[PDB]
């Protein structure tokens, strides 16, 4: 079956759940996880719940986990298809990081957006020039898409 590490992390997720984050294994794919992240406190996403999916590739942990939002969200570092701009998912990935580090980092990205990112949306531009409006729109989208 799975490498010991994947077994280790998978059962650590069930036994020791990350605060504000649910992560359940898929019913058919032992490397596939359905994640729900609670909107971080004092964020415009607070009160919302956001679906994410996580996949552990063959070459994991040499290769980074794959993660994507499945809930529409207004955020400079999440695009229209839910793809996440996070450097530890590409550039700064190392086998010591683990799954829950990624998940907490994603949560932290919600808590503190990075509009100044080079490969940022277009939402970023609104976030840079009119941060107040962007934050209200983030809250608007949370109401619209992340409350059910």
């Amino acid at each position: 079956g799975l490498p010991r590490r994947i077994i280790k992390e998978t059962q650590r997720l069930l036994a020791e759940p990350v605060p504000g984050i649910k992560a359940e294994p898929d019913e058919s794919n032992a490397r596939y996880f359905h994640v729900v992240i609670a909107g971080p406190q004092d964020s415009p996403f607070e009160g919302g719940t956001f679906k994410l999916e996580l996949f552990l590739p063959e070459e994991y942990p040499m290769a980074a986990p794959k993660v994507r939002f499945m809930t529409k969200i207004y955020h400079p570092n999440v695009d229209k298809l839910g793809r996440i701009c996070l450097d530890i998912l590409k550039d700064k990935w190392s086998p010591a990081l683990q799954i829950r580090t990624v998940l907490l980092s994603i949560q932290a990205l919600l808590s503190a957006p990075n509009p100044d990112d080079p490969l940022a949306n277009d939402v970023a531009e609104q976030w840079k020039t009119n941060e107040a409006q962007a934050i209200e729109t983030a809250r608007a989208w949370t109401r619209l898409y992340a409350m059910n």
Partner: protein, 139 residues
């Protein structure tokens, strides 16, 4: 009168036998206590063995006890297989991200792991043998 004397002697012998039996029972109880103590002692060395096992010798990449342990210039260690795979993508320590300048096999780590694992269950010993074979096939 002679019969009475014989009966008295028999009674005395019976009493002596009873005393001997009691002494034997006490000895048996002491032996049982010693056995229990030995069992407790046997239980502890296994904990002292599972100490290095889980906590010190595991490769951070694969979470297995190191298989052909190698130590980098930055003083961190990994399985030879794991670091060799990592270095196909990044020439930096997975732990501290320092540039890798040297990779050195460690006989002491390997011998310590091999010697300790040899005392654990068949299941644990066999998994290691399988992993070595699998990694070998990979090579």
């Amino acid at each position: 009168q002679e019969h009475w004397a014989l009966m008295e002697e028999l009674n005395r012998s019976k009493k002596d036998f009873e005393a001997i039996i009691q002494a034997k029972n006490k000895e048996l109880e002491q032996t049982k206590e010693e056995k229990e103590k030995m069992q407790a002692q046997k239980e502890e060395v296994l904990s002292h063995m599972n100490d290095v096992l889980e906590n010190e010798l595991q490769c951070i990449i694969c979470s297995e006890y190191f298989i052909e342990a190698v130590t980098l210039n930055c003083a961190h260690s990994f399985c030879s297989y794991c670091i060799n795979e990592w270095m196909k993508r990044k020439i930096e320590c997975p732990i501290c991200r320092k540039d890798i300048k040297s990779k050195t096999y460690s006989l002491v780590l390997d011998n310590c792991i091999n010697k300790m694992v040899n005392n654990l269950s068949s299941e644990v010993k066999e998994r290691r043998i399988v992993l070595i074979r699998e990694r070998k096939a990979k090579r």
